[PDB]
Structures are given as C-alpha cells and as structure tokens.
Design a protein around this ligand. Structure first.
Ligand SMILES: [Zn+2]
Ligand SMILES: [Zn+2]
Ligand SMILES: [Zn+2]
Ligand SMILES: [Zn+2]
Lengths: 331, 331
C-alpha cells in the first residue's frame, strides 16, 4: 500500500464546453491542483479570459472535490507585458506557456517581465519546421532556442514540459535550480516500438512523439534517481474517438484517469518507490514556490479495469489504456 | 502523354474469399502479370493450394482482362524441396517467399534446391526481435541474414522486396546480377514525417515502416538513376477500414488503384521519365527470365479523384490516397 500526500498535475489540458464538463472530474477527484494549459480555440491570452475559463472549470468541479486550477497564459506576439504581470500579481496566471507557433525573438519584453517578477515559463520545446525529422525536433529546440534563451535571461525559471529524450534529460539533469521538467506516464512506460510494432496505436500517439528505447530509459533513470526538478505532469490531452481513430488521428493521450497508477508502476519497476511521493506531490510545489498539500491518498495494489470508452454529448472518449487492466487503485 | 508497355506488379497481396473478389479487378485491369504473395491464412505452402488459389484468382478476373497471376510458395520448415521444385518445373510457383517467421538456418535444403533450379527467392528483409527498434530492423537484416545467405548460396537469385532504406539501396546498387529489389510507391512518395507530423496517418502505415527522409531520397535516386535491377512492386496490401482506423491499425496500403500514376509522378519529379517504362515493364521480366508484355497502355495528364472508400460484403476498403486528387489517368 502506498500512502502519499495528495498529488498535483503540473501539466493538463481541460479543453472547454462539454468536454471540459466530462474530463474535469477525473482530475479533481485525485489532484489538489493542476497547471491548466491555455491552448483553447481561441487561446487564453488575457486575464479576463483566464478568469472566465477558471470559473468554467470550477463550475464543472464536483461537490466535495478540493481542486484548484492554476491558470496559464498563452504567449502571443500581441500580449502586453503589463497584462501578464497583472494576472500574475492577482493570482490569475501561475505561469505562461510558450508553444512553437510563437517565436521567442518576438516576445522579449514579455519574457523579460516574467524574469523580473519571477513568473515561470513553461516550454513545449520543439522546432516544427517541415524539414526537421519529427524525432529530432526536441533535440533541435535545445540548441537553437532553449540554451540561447536561458543564456539571455539567466534569472528566468523554465519548465521544459513533457521531455521525451536523453538530450533533454541530460540538459535538465545538468542545468541549474532555475530549470525543471515534467514527464508524462506514457514517455516512461513506452517507446516508439509500442506505438508502431504489430500495428499502429493512435492512442499512444502524442506530442512530443514517443522516441527510441534509449530515450525512454534515460527518462526512467532520471525519475528513479531522486533528481528533484522533475515532477508529475500528465499532459492529459483528450480528443473524441472519431478524432483519434481516423485517417488523421490527433496527438494526445487522455490519461487523467490512469496516470497516477501508471507512475506508481514505473517507480516500482525501477526499485525507486522512495522517490514516488516527491515526484507526485513535493518537487512541483517546491519549484513553483507553493505549499505541499496536506491531505493524503493511498494507492492499493488492486487490479482495476479501464473503461473501453467514456461518453460525450456525441461519439466517445477513449481513455489511455482503454479496456486494459491496471495495477493500482486510488483509495 | 506517357505510352508504356503494359506493366507488371512484382509484389502484390490479393487476399482471398470476398476481398480477393473485390481487389483483383484493380490489378487485372492494368497489369499483365503479378507476383502474388502467399501469406494467406493459412499460407500457400503446397502446389495444390497454389493451383487452387490461382484458379480462385482467375475466377475473379473480369472478362477481357489479360492477366496472369504468378504464384509464390510461403517457405516453412516443413516444406519438402521436392514439392517446391515440382511446382517450379510445372509452372505453378514462379518464386518462393521468405518471411521473418521462417528461419534461413531451418530451410537450407529448400534454399539449396532453389539455387540449383534457378528459382528466385523473394525476401521480406527484417529482423523482428522485440529488442530491435522498428526503424533499424531492415538494416539489421542485411548484415545478420542477407549477406551470410548470399555468401553461402552464391548462385541464388534474390529479390529484396519493398526496400525502404539507403542501407538496402546501397546494398542492392552495389551487389551483383543475382540481386534485385522492388520499391513501392509510398516509400518513394513519403517519409516518416508524412505518417506522423500533424496527425497519425494509418493509411501510410505499412511494413517496412516509412523511414527518415534521407532514406526516401536514396530510394528516389536509385530509381531515377536507371539502375535496372529495381522494378515495380506495389506491395498492395488491403485491409478493411475497421482494421486500418482502429486502436491497433493493420500494416499495409491498398495502393493497386493508384500506384502506377504515383510512380509516374515520382519519375517526373526526378527528371527521369526516360527510365519510367523500364521500371514498370522491362527490368522485372529481365530479372525473372520472362518476356516483356507486347500490349501498351498510356498515362495521360488528367486530374483524377480517388474513391473515399470501396465497398466490401461488410464495412469498407479505404484506398491509398482516398479522397485525394491524383495527376495521371490510365488510358
Ligand atoms: Zn506540449
Ligand atoms: Zn500539453
Ligand atoms: Zn513484406
Ligand atoms: Zn508484401
């Protein structure tokens, strides 16, 4: 039996409208807080929009779930640094998120303000040029964007989100107290062979794409080492079935329902359960300057079955590890 | 306008039962002959079974289509060399096919007989061990299986089927008159980015898996060079939709309907239309010791539209390039 401080999810997608209403409870039932990514359509780029989104999230949180969404701002070339800093000072924005659609060299005033106020920058670290092989895009981001940025803004706190490579694992392990990373359950559990051998498995397709085994092993080693600037972020990224099992399936695993148990299994596999609690419930709060939760949950060794699908308004949501049997249940 | 000798398809899957009935006409309408792979359930491992399968194929060939299936034997550890040689001498088996499920070291008497009678060996050249990354399996086959085999049986004719790597392209370009290869349209047209960037595309999933761009370029260069021991083989490998767009999609592109036009486009792209006819209609017959066809077709520059699906008994067959617009039409 595993007793841990209630965890938090440092990287989550809740979407919006009815999907939001469906997926929130799976997070709010387990985690005390989550970093709520801003990539809606349209994205959350203003305080008012984040206020509104947070209330839509709260409206959707079941009664008796003690859950706080930590909001983020989608960095754009038009964002006024003053808007960002106001959201940060007012407790609206916990962090700001940089996606490849936005160029660092276009938003230097915003980044400089984040540095000055101590707001963390969350990075989806890929260079997305068509002439870069998909498996190389994360490595390429390190040398071409991440390092020069961190050299220019030396006080800036950066979370390298959902790292998937030895390149990134080494970079993070070897960097300073201002650099951290999150790791999903899928990038610990699997490598590209799992996605592509004996069939193509769209429910294991996500970005950054699963990499070769050597990379999975590097990630597993980093968590299992006790390194305390890596922490739980699921990157739970739900899409409807017709949208994962199609001629052009979307990237993202709906893993909120199973993630915690999956990380427990990985830590057990690596003979590193002593580091499981810090990963889920300590290392994140430490990097972000927030308190650790003071309620507790337990994982008990108990065969569960994962739902084959979950309903939405129309068609279905096919969870990560759908139909499969997992090892831990949340008490 | 392109006028060519009627082509042949040196690598095809026709399946069986109703699927056979649906897919044959798309081949028989265009090609004079095809190498019909033996991987049925159960596989074609006896003359009697190949006789029967060939008649099931012929039963399904529309009236006025001048099409001859060239049958192959699925090599197994239990196959009597005498059965094989009888099929070859009687015109039943044109060639025998080695899949990774069968080990070379188990069938040395059979291979030795093929060498002696001059029967070509067709190889699906991958090592399928779980501890070998999917992208490395073809390269690994060259050093661990192909080279030692060709060193042991120096008179043996071998077609390295559906080659997908520079490793294989170089190996074949640099080998002797007893070594040849086939190349699919998809491995010329695309690289792994096409399968995995901006979405996962199960209809581009096939074995051997699409490789990095450097490999696609090597293949394109080999065909465009005029090297005359590469030839058309589509590896048309149909599956039903529910089986390509599922939680675990099958490997194989149903490309019979579009392949010829797709190769024409590739050769035009590479400023190598002078080599297009030999590829489709000369180089194969030459390697196999068979006559070239003496009827002709034409490809005319004409926007066609590819069917979104094709019906079967139940559910549908989603062709390669389904719904898309292609450049050539067969006159
Ligand atoms: Zn991301
Ligand atoms: Zn994300
Ligand atoms: Zn094959
Ligand atoms: Zn094949």
């Amino acid at each position: 039996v595993l007793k841990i401080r209630r965890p938090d999810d440092w990287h989550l997608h809740l979407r919006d409208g009815d999907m939001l209403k469906t997926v929130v409870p799976y997070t709010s039932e387990i985690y005390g807080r989550a970093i709520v990514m801003p990539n809606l359509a349209p994205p959350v780029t203003t305080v008012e929009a984040a206020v509104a989104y947070r209330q839509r999230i709260l409206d959707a949180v079941p009664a008796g779930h003690d859950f706080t969404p930590l909001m983020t701002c989608y960095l754009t070339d038009s964002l006024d640094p003053n808007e960002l800093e106001r959201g940060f000072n007012e407790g609206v924005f916990t962090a700001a998120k940089l996606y490849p659609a936005t160029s660092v060299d276009a938003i230097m005033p915003v980044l400089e303000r984040m540095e000055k106020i101590g707001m963390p920058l969350l990075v989806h670290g890929e260079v997305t040029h068509a002439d870069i092989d998909i498996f190389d895009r994360e490595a390429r981001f390190i040398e071409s964007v991440m390092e020069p940025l961190r050299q220019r803004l030396t006080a800036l706190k950066v979370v390298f989100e959902h790292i998937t490579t030895k390149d990134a694992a080494d970079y993070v392990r070897d960097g300073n107290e201002r650099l951290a990373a999150t790791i999903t359950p899928q990038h610990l559990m699997f490598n590209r062979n799992h996605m592509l051998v004996g069939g193509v498995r769209p429910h294991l397709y996500c970005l950054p794409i699963l990499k070769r085994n050597i990379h999975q092993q590097a990630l597993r080693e980093l968590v299992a080492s006790g390194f305390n600037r890596v922490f739980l972020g699921t990157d739970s990224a739900p899409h409807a079935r017709h949208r994962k099992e199609s001629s052009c399936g979307c990237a993202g695993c709906f893993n909120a329902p199973t993630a915690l148990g999956s990380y427990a299994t990985v830590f057990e596999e690596m003979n590193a359960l002593q580091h499981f609690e810090a990963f889920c419930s300590v290392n994140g709060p430490q990097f972000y300057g927030l308190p650790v939760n003071d309620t507790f949950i337990e994982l008990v060794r108990e065969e569960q079955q994962v739902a084959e699908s979950i309903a939405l308004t129309d068609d279905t949501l096919v969870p990560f590890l759908a139909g499969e049997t997992v090892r831990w249940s949340v008490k």
